[PDB]
Amino acid sequence: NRLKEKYNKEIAPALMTKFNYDSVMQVPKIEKIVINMGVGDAVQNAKAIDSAVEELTFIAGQKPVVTRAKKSIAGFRLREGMPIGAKVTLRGERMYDFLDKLISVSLPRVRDFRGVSKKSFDGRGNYTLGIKEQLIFPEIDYDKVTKVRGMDIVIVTTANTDEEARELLTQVGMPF
Template sequence: KNFSYKNVMQVPRLKSIVLNVGMGEATQDIKPLEAAVKELATVTGQAPVITRAKKSIAGFKLREGMPVGCRVTLRGERMFDFLDRFISLALPRIRDFKGVSPKSFDGRGNYAFGVREQIIFPEIVYDKVASIHGMDIIFVTTAKTNAEGKALLQSLGMPFKN
């Protein structure tokens, strides 16, 4: 590539993809969270972990340990299967999609991407969806800089805006 690496092991690679669904309304009613867990399992083929509140926040009527969302960490074969389906099937189904923003890198070569509707995934049947919610998708890489991370994701087929 364009970065002069002395060793083949220095070349950045995709470590994992993390999908996170934060459900603030799960504090009052557990049903939307259960639906989100099922949807994430359908999309990724892996059982999600329920995330719980770290602290109590009175303003949000939240107690420590209450379920507030769910997440899945994909690695290996499942990660690349998901990446392929995400780029070729899910991204084109986003409304007014012109490419993903190149500004969403964290300074360490990891890329975070927010999805407003979970129905962009073809595995989710629109008629069975009770509530539309978004999710965060984080691509964790071994890259040291944003430029390296972007080059890696571009080579994997990620459509960045110009």
Template sequence: MKTFYKNEILAGLQEELGLKNPMEVPKLEKIVINMGVGEATQNAKAMDGAIADLTIIGGQKPIIRKAKKSIAGFKLRENMPVGVKVTLRGDRMYEMFDRLLSTALPRIRDFRGLSPKSFDGRGNYSFGVTEQLIFAEIDYDQIDKIRGMDITIVTTATTDAEGRALLKRFGFPFREK
């Protein structure tokens, strides 16, 4: 994917966006995968399954996210673990992006493409996945519970149009209107 970006996408995107300097061309910066584990407030063991799943998916050990504030309605105290996240950069990021496009997204049930409106205004794209089973690395017999996750693709693009153009060049499956 990295060589594909350098050889195929870079020059075409520079021409399409009308940029003079090749360093101005948007590129992938990082991929952040976040998995909220709300049931960890009552059951401390619930976090172990999420950590195992995210380790297999991301290829590195995830960081445990803790609550910043206490919320009595959710029976949540400050510094209780509420989720896990992994940040992928460099070669792992490109490898994950390739797996996402080639195997994971096509395995989603009733998949018709991702919404083109999920950009954040700064060229970054976020979407949610309802189950971790779309990744081929996850063994169906080994999981304890079906969990969803949020995936954010952070780019160096400054606008949504630049980010959309970059992801389209990579072959990102956006839904047609």
């Protein structure tokens, strides 16, 4: 709730004059936040899938979904079906509030966090977060942490170009 009033009243008028769009409809938004898990433990351990089946729900209460790989892969010793990882999709109000957890709280718990990767855009206006450790925010509760797998987060915007999604995240507060 805090970021939306910040985004609507402050961030959206700021970038509008910065690149001279002809409407509020041309002012780009950041719609959905999709989070992949993608654990290949099911070849070895089906019980290790249950870790982050339960655990990712504690991050955002929208429960992730069974993601079955749609091609049997013998080089990974994997048949088709056979669930690999989970999928946290998130769009709407809590997702900017999820971003409120990200910038303000999460990132200083990356124990050697610095100016994060600038050129990790797809040439479209979308961004991926390189995270390898899941102990980022005080829910994680180390004594109940047996699995050490991190997390992959995708930023999806309505940015028609790319280099103003560059300038979008700066006004959001993404450090670089």
